[PDB]
């Protein structure tokens, strides 16, 4: 158990292993402080992060953070869906010339949300190989939103759920204005269905958990 964190603790990454970390940054909303995870990928041709962070001071910080820890770059994002926590450093990404993966939807909602858009180069099932990191993303139909994508990690079996999956303390589904609540449950059945040994989970806001996370949001839509 390891977090490395700025001086304010705005910042933080925690170590689920060696080459797989979760992001972490507080977005304040009036006066409201709100989590949010993504994750970051040491690979032996640079770093890949899934999902940047609610605005530019944000993401900029939190690649300097992890470029100075692993001692190279950041190449590759992956976008799992077009709202402000997980696709509001796109501007950083460009400046940098960090490509930023995403569906076609997920790209098409970014440019009607006003954000840059990222490649929408993602089709429902896609294999990514980033040095000798395998990264599958896999779109399991509407949940929290019409777009959301989940990213798998087949070497590790560590699912990064997104806003799809909620904490364990989680006692409500959060923000469901872009929601299909009535669809969300099928689709997390899907993710089950397709991942029949999943370690590690990591939700969109909250604590790491494991498959019980799935479960636990499956309650939450009854
Ligand atoms: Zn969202
Ligand atoms: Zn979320």
């Given at each position: 158990h390891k977090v490395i964190k700025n001086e304010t603790g705005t910042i933080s990454i925690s170590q689920?292993?060696?080459?797989?970390?979760?992001?972490?940054?507080?977005?304040?909303?009036?006066?409201?402080?709100?989590?949010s995870n993504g994750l970051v990928l040491?690979?032996?041709?640079?770093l890949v992060l899934?999902?940047?962070?609610?605005?530019?001071?944000?993401?900029?910080e939190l690649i300097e953070m992890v470029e100075?820890?692993?001692?190279?770059?950041?190449?590759?994002?992956?976008?799992?869906?077009?709202?402000?926590?997980?696709?509001?450093g796109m501007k950083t990404l460009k400046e940098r010339g960090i490509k930023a993966h995403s569906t076609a939807l997920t790209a098409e909602l970014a440019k009607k949300n006003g954000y840059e858009e990222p490649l929408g180069d993602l089709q429902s099932v896609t294999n990514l190989k980033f040095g000798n990191m395998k990264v599958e993303t896999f779109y399991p139909?509407?949940?929290?939103?019409?777009?959301?994508?989940?990213?798998?990690?087949?070497?590790?079996?560590?699912?990064?759920?997104?806003?799809?999956?909620?904490?364990?303390s989680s006692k409500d589904l959060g923000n469901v204005a872009?929601?299909?609540?009535?669809?969300?449950?099928?689709?997390?059945?899907?993710?089950?269905?397709?991942?029949?040994?999943?370690?590690?989970?990591?939700?969109?806001?909250?604590?790491?958990?494991?498959?019980?996370?799935?479960?636990?949001?499956?309650?939450?839509?009854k």
């Open positions: 689920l292993n060696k080459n797989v970390w979760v992001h972490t940054e507080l977005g304040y909303f009036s006066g409201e402080a709100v989590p040491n690979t032996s041709k640079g899934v999902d940047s962070s609610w605005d530019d001071k944000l993401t900029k100075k820890k692993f001692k190279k770059r950041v190449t590759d994002v992956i976008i799992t869906h077009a709202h402000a926590d997980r696709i509001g139909g509407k949940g929290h939103t019409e777009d959301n994508i989940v990213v798998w990690l087949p070497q590790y079996q560590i699912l990064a759920g997104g806003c799809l999956v909620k904490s364990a872009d929601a299909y609540v009535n669809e969300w449950s099928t689709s997390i059945e899907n993710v089950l269905k397709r991942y029949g040994n999943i370690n590690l989970v990591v939700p969109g806001h909250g604590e790491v958990g494991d498959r019980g996370l799935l479960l636990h949001t499956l309650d939450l839509l």
